[PDB]
Design a protein around this ligand. Structure first.
Ligand SMILES: O=P(O)(O)O[C@@H]1[C@H](O)[C@H](O)[C@@H](OP(=O)(O)O)[C@H](OP(=O)(O)O)[C@H]1O
Lengths: 49, 79
């Protein structure tokens, strides 16, 4: 896997796409509280596990 | 259309009785798998039998199979 850490300043590795985990949600739809999502790093490309 | 399985709700006769199921399709586009047996008419419950109109989230609904005319319902599972 690839490492996940906490950085005070931050960098491009903090960019995370929030993708729908349910088929009833599609890109461009508003995220509703209580929903299950996938946090996919933009550069790494592998979702948080 | 059940999105998670990407399948249409269909009612058809298997051996001698009508059963409700989700039909599996080999089409790449699941929504393109359209069949006449997967057509349902939406009925809004109203105190007036002859009155329809727009539905509401808090209202009651019935589903009628267009091809066969039966109504969707739930019964006891043998298992
Ligand atoms: O790609 P082709 O060679 O045109 O064949 C089509 C498709 O690939 C399936 O065989 C079938 O879908 P189902 O699995 O849903 O039967 C469809 O029938 P249809 O016309 O009844 O949709 C065919 O027309």
């Amino acid at each position: 896997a690839m490492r996940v850490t906490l950085d005070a300043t931050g960098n491009e590795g903090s960019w995370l796409f929030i993708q729908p985990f349910w088929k009833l949600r599609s890109n461009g739809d508003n995220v509703v509280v209580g929903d299950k999502v996938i946090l996919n790093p933009v550069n790494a490309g592998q979702p948080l596990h | 259309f059940h999105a998670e399985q990407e399948k249409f709700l269909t009612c058809d006769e298997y051996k001698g009785k009508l059963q409700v199921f989700l039909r599996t399709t080999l089409r790449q586009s699941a929504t393109s798998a359209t069949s006449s047996n997967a057509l349902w008419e939406v009925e809004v419950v109203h105190h007036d039998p002859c009155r329809g109109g727009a539905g509401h989230w808090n209202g009651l609904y019935r589903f009628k199979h267009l091809a066969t005319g039966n109504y969707l319902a739930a019964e006891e599972n043998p298992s």
